[PDB]
Design a protein around this ligand. Structure first.
Ligand SMILES: CC(C)=CCC/C(C)=C\CC/C(C)=C/CC/C(C)=C/CC/C(C)=C/CC/C(C)=C/CC/C(C)=C/CC/C(C)=C/CC/C(C)=C\CC1=C(C)C(=O)c2ccccc2C1=O
Ligand SMILES: CCCCCCCCCCCCCCCC(=O)O[C@H](COC(=O)CCCCCCC[C@@H](C)CCCCCCCCC)COP(=O)(O)O[C@H]1[C@H](O)[C@H](O)[C@H](O)[C@@H](O)[C@@H]1O
Lengths: 54, 55
């Protein structure tokens, strides 16, 4: 006997889309954070960069 | 004798017997039995399982 499911079905297929993972509910109960500070405002954390352009 | 033998053999063996289809492996679709899963089963939705090489 042959297994029930095989063969292409003459269907070409499509290139897999770039993977975009989601946050981890099972492992992380909440959303992890980076830098910490007092941040008495809307929220900036302990990490804020800048780029100087000409 | 028959009842005692049945009970004693059940007592011996029941230690060994393990339900292979007890849902033990956590999965994005609820706990599942081991044979239905592997390291590639997404433990949570959208989980990124990298094809990591074994150096
Ligand atoms: C949760 C869990 C695993 C629980 C289980 C517990 C566990 C791990 C183990 C124990 C479980 C079990 C299997 C318990 C029962 C053990 C067992 C086979 C009991 C049988 C006893 C019984 C039910 C008797 C029913 C009444 C009846 C009709 C008795 C007459 C017929 C029988 C059974 C005769 C047996 C005769 C007998 C004990 C022979 C033993 C053979 C041996 C090693 C030696 C014989 C022997 C003897 C006995 C001498 O006294 C002696 C004295 C001086 C010189 C020489 C000898 C000699 O050669
Ligand atoms: C004549 C005997 C009449 C009784 C028939 C025996 C079979 C009936 C089973 C009914 C119980 C099912 C519901 C409740 C129970 C349930 O759900 O358990 C199941 C497993 O059934 C058990 O309980 C242990 C089974 C008992 C051993 C039976 C051995 C077969 C018999 C037929 C052979 C000896 C009898 C004499 C005949 C031969 C005569 C010789 C001349 C699944 O395991 P699991 O959910 O993982 O839990 C695990 C725990 O069991 C486990 O002890 C523990 O070790 C952990 O593994 C745990 O993971």
């Amino acid at each position: 006997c042959s297994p029930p499911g095989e063969t292409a079905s003459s269907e070409p297929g499509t290139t897999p889309a770039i993977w975009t993972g989601s946050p981890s509910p099972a492992a992380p109960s909440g959303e992890d954070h980076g830098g910490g500070h007092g941040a008495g405002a809307a929220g900036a954390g302990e990490t804020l960069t800048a780029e100087l352009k000409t | 004798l028959g009842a005692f033998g049945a009970g004693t053999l059940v007592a011996f063996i029941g230690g060994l017997i393990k339900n292979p289809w007890k849902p033990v492996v956590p999965t994005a679709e609820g706990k599942k039995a081991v044979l239905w899963t592997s390291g590639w089963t997404p433990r949570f939705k959208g989980e990124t399982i990298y094809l990591a090489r074994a150096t």
